[PDB]
């Protein structure tokens, strides 16, 4: 839905890295290199960001009803 604040397994804060990750993917860096640069070293933290599906973009498309 929206990026989780913490890593499930260990609890590192990954919620402040989604925008940097998107900008890194924009400038051509492949996913492993982007995750390396954000200093996500444990594969739990890495799969937190690598497997996220951002559905809030899809939910926001339905007009506010008030």
């Amino acid at each position: 839905m929206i990026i989780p604040v913490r890593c499930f397994s260990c609890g590192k804060v990954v919620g402040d890295k989604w925008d940097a990750y998107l900008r890194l993917l924009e400038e051509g860096k492949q996913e492993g290199d982007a995750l390396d640069e954000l200093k996500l070293k444990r594969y739990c933290c890495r799969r937190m960001v690598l497997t996220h599906v951002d559905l809030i973009e899809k939910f926001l498309r339905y007009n506010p009803l008030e």
Binding site: M1, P4, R47, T51, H52, V53, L55, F59, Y62, L65
Partner: peptide, 19 residues
């Protein structure tokens, strides 16, 4: 994705789906 404007008898939505 429009589960919030639908009214069904039962619905379950995972908080943080992952591929």
């Amino acid at each position: 994705t429009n589960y919030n404007v639908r009214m069904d008898t039962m619905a379950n939505i995972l908080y943080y789906p992952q591929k």
